[PDB]
């Protein structure tokens, strides 16, 4: 919850002794949960928190490849439009929200938007 994550390696020589290699902030909120995979040549760990953006890291190439910020927004666009009506539509947990635009763009082409 310091929006921060670290990686640690076993010390060479001394058995059972490890140490931090490094740390870094990837997320912008905490890192609530994670899961790691190592298969078909893909060693990754996916970290999810509260900033809605999954962040995936290489394991075997950690510190060798950049991370990936997956889209915090869903795969479906969840935005609709009746263009003849110029109505825009977006739904979430129980509600559907509708805006009407009521004008074009060439008419304006500040205070009236």
């Amino acid at each position: 919850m310091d929006r921060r994550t670290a990686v640690y390696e076993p010390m060479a020589g001394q058995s059972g002794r490890w140490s931090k290699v490094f740390h870094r902030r990837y997320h912008q909120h905490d890192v609530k949960a994670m899961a790691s995979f190592e298969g078909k040549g893909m060693s990754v760990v996916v970290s999810g928190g509260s900033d809605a953006s999954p962040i995936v890291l290489p394991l075997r190439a950690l510190g060798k490849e950049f991370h990936r910020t997956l889209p915090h927004l869903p795969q479906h666009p969840t935005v609709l439009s009746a263009p003849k009506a110029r109505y825009i539509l977006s739904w979430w947990e129980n509600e559907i929200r509708i805006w009407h635009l009521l004008n074009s763009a060439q008419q304006f082409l500040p205070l009236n938007l």
């Binding site: 390696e9 140490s19 931090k20 290699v21 490094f22 510190g63 060798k64």
Partner: peptide, 8 residues
């Protein structure tokens, strides 16, 4: 092998 120092 892949070398990587510990950061401080």
């Amino acid at each position: 092998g892949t070398i990587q120092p510990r950061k401080y």
